Write a protein that binds this ligand. Sequence first.
Ligand SMILES: *[C@H]1O[C@H](CO)[C@@H](O)[C@H](O)[C@H]1NC(C)=O
Ligand SMILES: [Cl-]
Length: 485
Amino acid sequence: AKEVVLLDFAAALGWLTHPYGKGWDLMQNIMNDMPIYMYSVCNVMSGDQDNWLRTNWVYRGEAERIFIELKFTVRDCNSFPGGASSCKETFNLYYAESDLDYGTNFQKRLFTKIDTIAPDEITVSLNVEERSVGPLTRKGFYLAFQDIGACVALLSVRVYYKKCPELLQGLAHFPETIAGSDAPSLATVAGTCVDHAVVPPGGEEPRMHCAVDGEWLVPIGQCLCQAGYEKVEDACQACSPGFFKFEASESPCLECPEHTLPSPEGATSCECEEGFFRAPQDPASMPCTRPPSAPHYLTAVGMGAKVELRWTPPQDSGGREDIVYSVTCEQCGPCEASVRYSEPPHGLTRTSVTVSDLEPHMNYTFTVEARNGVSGLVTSRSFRTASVSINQTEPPKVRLEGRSTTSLSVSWSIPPPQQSRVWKYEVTYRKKGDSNSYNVRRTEGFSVTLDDLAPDTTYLVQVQALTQEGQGAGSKVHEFQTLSP
Ligand SMILES: *[C@H]1O[C@H](CO)[C@@H](O)[C@H](O)[C@H]1NC(C)=O
Ligand SMILES: [Cl-]
């Protein structure tokens, strides 16, 4: 775990002693053909000791919490001739922040005690200890060591801050970040997106925290490979030629779908080969599709004035499920509003419709076309046709125009446009009650007189305009009556 050092006594500076002369004092020994320095003080006999040793001004840089490591020795208070109660076996560690170098202007009251330092190993004619303080927030700081009446040898001091390693995590890159001072107040570090990577709409953007111990803590958000690109190891390559990636996801590059042209490197979509198309609604994931073929077959059986257009889906959906049917009509020329559709005629999803109100004696032709969500792209037409004529025309209006004791003058009417079909007019009559005797005569006229009948009798008259045989339209059964003398 990287550590940045701000002050290292061992490598070596002549620090400030107070008071000067007595108290702390730089000293030297010999080892491995090399000089060894140390600040010592051994005033155990003397009743009251208050010896201060101050380190020169250390720059804080951007360090937030510093770690102080000390290596020292301590003699046993029981080994000195005096060795009275005036001998301690510990010393005190202080610090102070400032924006300028006080130089020689050392002032005890300005210092904050960090802790007392006690020997792990006491000797008789080396203890290692570490502490830390934060947060620091000024240009520089001092360290101060206080003697209270012991025999101490200070061999080493190191003050450093911990640091978080640079890394790449989820396509994001974070840089060396100074570790934080306190956990409850841990800042957040933004990461930047590797080439060809991005943060999608709208996920969390890359973040991570540098903990006191110099460790990366809680990873937030992530970067994904931009469209046209895919993740390989910890980088983003372009999609191979023949593949595509429309949205920035975690998935790999997909191969082009059906009916598409081989894509160039780093493709976000495969264009569709001539003959096929895609709708706006269509995702670039589905294959380009085609317009449908006309309905497979079409029937139109007309029960009276209504009719039943049944039909079946195209033999070729064009590769879609959004096929809708449209129905028009011929009467020549287009039908008016005269015809009623059981349902709206255009934009149908069913495969059968009932139209009604068809004036007899006219064959209409209905056309049904099938189209899908891609028909609007081409100007062709794919439809089926079916025609029907109802011959039932038309319930004649009967009424009399003359009466006698024995004869009835009967006449019927019917619009000229329909007087064409009518092959012959069948006239039927019989006395009331009688059901074993029928009187029937035919004619092309619109009037007839019934001869040789009984007086004061109601007759049943039924006229039927045949078209041509057994397929004609009957009339209301009227009731007329002879006259009395
Ligand atoms: C419909 O009338 C036409 C004349 O427009 C005729 O050719 C045809 O036979 C009729 N319908 C049928 C059942 O063929
Ligand atoms: Cl602290």
